Amino acid sequence: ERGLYFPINHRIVDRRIASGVTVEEADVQSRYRRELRTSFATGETRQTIPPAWSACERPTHFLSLRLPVRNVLRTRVNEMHNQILFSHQQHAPLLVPLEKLHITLGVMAISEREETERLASIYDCVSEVFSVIHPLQLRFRGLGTFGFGRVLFIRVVPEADFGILETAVSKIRRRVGGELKVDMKGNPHDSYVPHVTIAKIRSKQQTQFGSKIPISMWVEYQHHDFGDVTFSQVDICSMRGSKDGYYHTEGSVHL
Amino acid sequence: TIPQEALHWLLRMIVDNFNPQHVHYIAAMKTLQNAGELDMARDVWKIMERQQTWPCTSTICAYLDVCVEAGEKTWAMEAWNRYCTELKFLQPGEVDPKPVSRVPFSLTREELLYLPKWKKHFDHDPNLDVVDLNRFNRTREVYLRMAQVMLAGGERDSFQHFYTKLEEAMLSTPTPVPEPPNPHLVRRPQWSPYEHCKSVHHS
Amino acid sequence: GLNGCVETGRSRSEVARDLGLSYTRPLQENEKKQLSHQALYYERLAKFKMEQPEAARALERERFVRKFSGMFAKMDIKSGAPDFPSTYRKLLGTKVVRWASKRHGP
Amino acid sequence: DTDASKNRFFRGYVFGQRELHQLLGRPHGFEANNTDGSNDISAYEMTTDQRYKGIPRPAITNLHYEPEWNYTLYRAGTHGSQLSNPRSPLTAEVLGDELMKIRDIKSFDHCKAWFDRLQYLIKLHYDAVGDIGEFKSRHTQHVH
Amino acid sequence: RDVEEKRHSRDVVNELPNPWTDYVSHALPFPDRDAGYPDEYGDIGQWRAPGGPGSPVKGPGYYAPPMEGEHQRGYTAEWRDLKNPMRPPEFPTPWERKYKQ
Amino acid sequence: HEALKKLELDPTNEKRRRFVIRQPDGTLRSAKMSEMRAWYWKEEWADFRFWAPNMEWGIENTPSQEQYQEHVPDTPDADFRKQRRIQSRPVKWFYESHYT
Amino acid sequence: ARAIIKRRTPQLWGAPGAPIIRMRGHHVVWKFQSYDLFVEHTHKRRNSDARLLHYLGKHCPHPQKSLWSPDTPVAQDRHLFMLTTVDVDAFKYWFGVKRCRLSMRPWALLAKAGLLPPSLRQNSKIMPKPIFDKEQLMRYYLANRKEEATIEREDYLNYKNSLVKSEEERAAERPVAPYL
Amino acid sequence: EAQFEHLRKVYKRQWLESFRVNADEYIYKYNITKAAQLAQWEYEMQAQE
Amino acid sequence: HATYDVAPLSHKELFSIYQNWDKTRDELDLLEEVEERISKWKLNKWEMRIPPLLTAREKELMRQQQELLKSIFFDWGKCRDAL
Amino acid sequence: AKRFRYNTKYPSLVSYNKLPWEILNHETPEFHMHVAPHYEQIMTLAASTHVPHIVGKKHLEMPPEHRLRLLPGMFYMLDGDSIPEGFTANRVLDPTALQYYGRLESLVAPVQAVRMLISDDLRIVCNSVTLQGPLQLPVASYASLASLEVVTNKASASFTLFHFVRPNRPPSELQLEKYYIHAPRAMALAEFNSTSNTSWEPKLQAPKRSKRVTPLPAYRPPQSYLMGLAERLAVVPGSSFGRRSLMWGHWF
Amino acid sequence: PWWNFQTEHRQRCVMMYGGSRAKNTHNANHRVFIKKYKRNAFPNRTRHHWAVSMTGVLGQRPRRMPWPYDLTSLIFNQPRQGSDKIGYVVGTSMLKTAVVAANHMVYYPKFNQRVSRTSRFFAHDEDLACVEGDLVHIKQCRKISKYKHYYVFSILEPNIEGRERLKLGLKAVPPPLFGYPVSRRIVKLN
Amino acid sequence: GQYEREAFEARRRLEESKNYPGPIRSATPGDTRFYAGSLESILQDNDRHYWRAVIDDPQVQYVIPLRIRFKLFTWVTTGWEQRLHIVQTMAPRDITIARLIELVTIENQSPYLCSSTFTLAVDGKELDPDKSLSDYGITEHSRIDAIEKLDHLLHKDSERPLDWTVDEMTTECLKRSPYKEMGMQPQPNLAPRYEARPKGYFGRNNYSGMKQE
RNA sequence: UAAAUUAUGGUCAAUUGUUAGUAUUCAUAUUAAUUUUUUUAAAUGUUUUAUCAUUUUAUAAAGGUUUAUUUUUGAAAGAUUUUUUGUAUAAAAUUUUAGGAAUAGUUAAUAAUAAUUUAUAAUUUUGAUUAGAUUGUUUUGUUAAUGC
């Protein structure tokens, strides 16, 4: 009485059901409008998928662009946190602190038996790439999901400097992956999605807090503008934030 | 059906101005082997060849079985000379199933707008996917059917050659991760609740 | 990601899916609120069927009668030609007075 | 399928090629040096080498650059027509003189029949003027 | 069937091909040659002929190389068989003078 | 396809046209050339080069109701209207030489 | 399968029927009546096209003379000719390979062609239909027997592939030293 | 209809053992043609460059 | 064939790779045994030789350099056959 | 006549043309119609080979919370009849149900009694079929019923089969087919190895038969008004078994 | 037959030798227009009717006709016509939905000339990227709603001015100054 | 099965190899949402609407499409019928059956079936609501049944549906769950019209897997 | 910014009115018609089946339509000893009337939702909705011929 008769919203024919089965044998009634939902309607940010072994081991070293002081990302993230809390007292123990803020442009499983020597050659490959580059301006706009909703992050948009930055980071991915046979997560040839994780469900909270952050808590900001900011430093850091807040600065490069 | 209906349907796929994938070759070679139309499983080779196509490891193994059964070493020596030579066993350091590599053939705007209409045409030529259909290294199979046909035709010497070379690599090199099943040749089962079925004592 | 593929046929945003990039304009508050609302329908289903499965059942009855009442019950081309009023012009002023015009869209 | 070099309709400057060139940044000119309507090539194509942009070489091209490779597998008459041409030695040796004689018996009969009829008409009308029937006399014109 | 086949094989006139029953001459859907049909302009099959510019192309009977192919590099087989006019032909023929000219 | 009659009437062509004449005694036989040529659209041939053809619609070829617009006797004697005096009518093509 | 059947024009089953090699031909004055032989389905719409498959030929029911050949002193040739144009090869593809039903007037023709055996309904009224009995039928097969080794061949090369790649001249496809 | 269904096969031994030969030959010719037009596209690509 | 793990070397890479020390390495005998092989090659042997693990930039310059070498080897091949 | 692909026609929230769900009901003889020809193959099984869970020693003892966690699908044979715990038993004498067990009994020891047991929870029903006497099967020494001590003991062995299920459940979750392993009779071969080996002389050829077969009684063609040609009628030679082109033995 | 002359006709059944069998329909009939209204009383408002109509389509005259040989067939090879269409995306205000305005070819045989024509399409764009103006490629699919059988298959140029206009906040395109053409002298003062 | 078994074998070997780089995600294509045909069809998890001739990597299936065969009382207008009602739920691989059944409860669109709390089963033996799907071995193939709190009573005739074909529908039945809506006395439009299966459809006796007649 | 031919190559384009100062498709002609002539039509009872049932037999009455009408093996062809599969509704181009303007169970997304979900929605002067004539895209007539 207010639309089509047999809408194409519900026009669906699933073919993992055998033939004839829905004809004369059996009914398969389900809800298909959630398995046919788009990454734009959920938040699946197709993160570089690490294979078996590199998935078994935890991130040891990680390349990250450092945020400067007196940001816009920091302040808009601060108001996002105020509203996370005024929305729910539940969700404070899931948010990442403001000081742990960084920009993740790659994680890497490094062995300690060849630790500092490999870190040095990696530093060569990083500085030999980011030497001629100018300081980088990026765009933060709209969040997404890592770990199937486990991680909420303010992706940097590909709309200002992702081209240059990804030539750089796929170069250093190729170098750390095929040149010096270090374990970056994915293929030596893949391009790791640079990301700004703003909250996360960690294995130490999976049990109580879940395996999927509640899309109601943050979804008002899933497509919010978080700001365009400039940055000058690509740092390889070892995964220990408790040093002085920001993770152990195992190497820096100024731009 | 006569056996030849695959063959006819392969050709009629050609006359249809179609690009017979390697799966349309594996299938069409199995179904004439089953039927014992081996001169036909050969002319499927020759159709694959007149097409100037690159028989992936699977397809070389296929035609090599055909040479085995027909008992002609010559038939197989050329597949060896032509295609399954740059096939090398998995050396201890290198990755076993090197991933699929070729991206989905795409274009940018200045690629699509300026380039001629005949360069963009993508009717899936089967020689665009050998880089991944040989990503799974059936080399031991290949060498094995090589040794087989060598024995069949009666070349003790070359037979020893293939067998020995294969065995040493077996002893020395790791094992290539075998292929996940051909998602199109051998068919997935569909989930069918067998309730409304003629039971064991139905009649 | 600004381009589809030729082999696949998939779109700009779907290759941007299969590489993880975010091509999307700034959405106005309207395009924001419509989308937040479309983002919460499954939380509504989970908070609906679970603590008022009476109302879940009540609207079950409402819709379950309606899927049999009404106009059509099978799917023919006559049934589900995705725009009845303009696919069938010979039948709009006399018989089917539901619609007052033969055309409403491009 | 076809292109601006095949289809005489494609090089219509009035609305097709004019927009093509206003898109492709070419110099589009009414009576242009390039037949389609383009005055010359655009900045983009001028700079960038396109020969291998886009797609590889469809490797049947070798079927032209190589003749030994293309063949027709089964010969000509195998599908049953080996005996279409009556006078090929294929048929001659398949059948043999007895069967070819048999098979041409009817043609021999045709000629022999024409000659029997002619020779009788000649016996009859050979004396050219006399009478033969109730009111029919010998006319040469039947023989002729 | 058996008694009829016995008498049929006893028939001498048989054992000849009946080309109506023996083969399907052209089983595909399309003719083996362009048969008087129209052309791109509508020049109906009589106003035209095959082999002109409307045909499929004939391709270069060579290879199309870049820089160092036939520009003074060396020579192909088409360089020893060609003969200068002064020196005689290998094999004698009694070509007519008039046809020679 | 009349464009290709000279093909489809040549024994060496395996895609030859096939004609069969079942005589009244059941015996199958294959066509005569004349019948083969009957099945195409009429073939005219007259090479004016050295010897004139017998071109149609003469004074003599045509009959009355076509030539003039009344029936006119076909007298073999004294047809003055064809400016003719007598007309011995021997067989059409008997006495002339064959090439003509 | 219809509420109010069409009465003179029901066939056996279904709306688009099996293909049938019909031989229609418009009824006007006998002089102007010649037969459109053609493949088509059983259940058509009112005209001869909407399930027309493949025009198959035309028949002249009117026996014509040898006015395309000269006046032979040959009887069987002087007899009137009855002419028809088939589509022999698309008939073989339809009849043989797609299995279209061969109606009885068209069959009455093609029988005369030599494609199909003379039909069921060319009944020599003047001779009776047969008398079957197992004693004599088995006593014959007993008497004259043909072998498995002569029957399996013909079964194969008469219903299955018959291009015997002559084992000797399969040598021409087994290459020589440069690849042998 | 023993002969009438003996033929309905024989005309699948005849219509296919003929489509075999004739699609073989159609491809041997459309392959010369396909390959030659492909070569010309490559050549005109050179002269364009 | 240009399978994974295979990429266009450099000159230093080539020196480090193809360095085995034997002396009965006749220039004009190794070269003729390579060139006759590349003359018996057939045009599909030049098919799979672009390592797929490259950007669009390098892949086309690879095809470029490759059809260069390929034309050059065919020139030498026809020259050597006329020779 | 083959099987079509998908329901493209109707809203699948209202199951329309679907052949209905078979539910074997314990009250009515259909329960035994299905579960009856199954027991005979498990009998030939446990008479050929040893399969573990058949020959128990006693009932299973499980709390009434876990009864339905192990039992449903449990089927085993005890030395004598004895109701397991938590059940009530109802004998059945319905001949329309008993009739099926004919093929059971004429191949093994004849069936003595048949019961349906229902749990005090009402939800686990045990069809319990008690057999009696010397078996007709050459039960093998390495069977399971051989360890059931029945073929060891003399005549009058009353062993009893139990099959537990939930009620109102289709003939799918009746896990009685998974024992359709067919094992032959080697006792038959057991003649040619012991003391009959010198006693039995085998004949390999055929003997010279000088006498042809004695013919059947002469055929009197039917005299009723026949249905007609059972070829053209699609009726299998006896409406029972055969090939519709092997139309032997329908009146002619 | 047609090629025969009226009085030389005999038999309207067959065609003896060859030619074209066809029914000589009677085009010459003085079709008329029966005035059932008055020049001041018409039950239409916009287009009044006062003389016979020429009826048909692919038959009206000037004989417009379908022509595939346009921008689209110059750029893309197609399986079936209309598949691929390039245009100035104009109108996207329906959430996740684009309106792509791309042209076809209308050839006039009589004149020997063309005019390609405009059409506001529906085109799905999951994830809302395109802004009014991005020259986009649009491809056809399975349908997406009542009216969208298309989806945004690429961008060929994104309106970077527009995208920044949104980022700053303004309307990515100012809206037309005036409405559709009316017939009433709307007197806007102050 | 020659596919499930073998794809599990290889899916397992793939992580029985640590010398494996990862998948090139730009080269691991997803599936297209827009395609040719007419419908918004769903193919498998391993399948693409287009041709992808590769043998892509056999990946673990995170969320399973679990199929639970309920029991919906249907109304052909000649009695009430028992027929198969699968509700195929996309459920993860890590979940406890308690939350799985909570999930199916939220998932169904016919609350004819989630009026009273029910339980799961596979070839009979119930599953506990404290362990998880792999705790028994639930794939998408586990030939699962579902059992209501009144399944052991449907041979009975007390709660069995009181249909107007053979039973008296009182006024109180005319304000209870199915019958307030079922539409007893035919409106000018027969308002909610249901199916209709003949009283002589199957023959003299009902539907069984084995031949009775 | 070169002539060239081994001499008609590749198969027919061709317009027939006695007017009346002059401008202008415009009375009288001829062609196809219609007016015009009984050599193409015609009948009723469909038919089986085991039986008060059931198997078989699916686009001519109009109905007024110009953003319009589109769809499969599962029936049948159709062949075996059994459970046997993935190919369908979508479109795309063309749409009339002298004086031309507003139209509406609405557009998209969610949806196997909302008789009261979300919203800056959709059709239109590139001529919309109402109303009017009209059966929609290899059949003719004329003309040397684009046309008409």
TrEMBL record, chain C:
Shown residues within the full chain: 323 to 428 of 429
Name of this chain's protein: Uncharacterized protein
Annotated source species: Trypanosoma cruzi (strain CL Brener)
Source superkingdom: Eukaryota
UniProtKB/TrEMBL annotation, chain D:
Record's protein name: Uncharacterized protein
Species of provenance: Trypanosoma cruzi (strain CL Brener)
Residues included from the entire protein: 146 to 289 of 1827
TrEMBL record, chain J:
Domain of life: Eukaryota
Protein name: Uncharacterized protein
Lineage: Eukaryota, Discoba, Euglenozoa, Kinetoplastea, Metakinetoplastina
From TrEMBL, chain K:
Keywords, ordered alphabetically: Ribonucleoprotein, Ribosomal protein
GO MF terms, alphabetically ordered: structural constituent of ribosome
Transmembrane segments: none
Tagged with keyword Ribonucleoprotein: yes
Protein's name in the database: 30S Ribosomal protein S17-like protein
Lineage of the organism: Eukaryota, Discoba, Euglenozoa, Kinetoplastea, Metakinetoplastina
GO cellular component: mitochondrion; ribonucleoprotein complex; ribosome
Family listed: Belongs to the universal ribosomal protein uS17 family.
One GO BP annotation of this record: translation
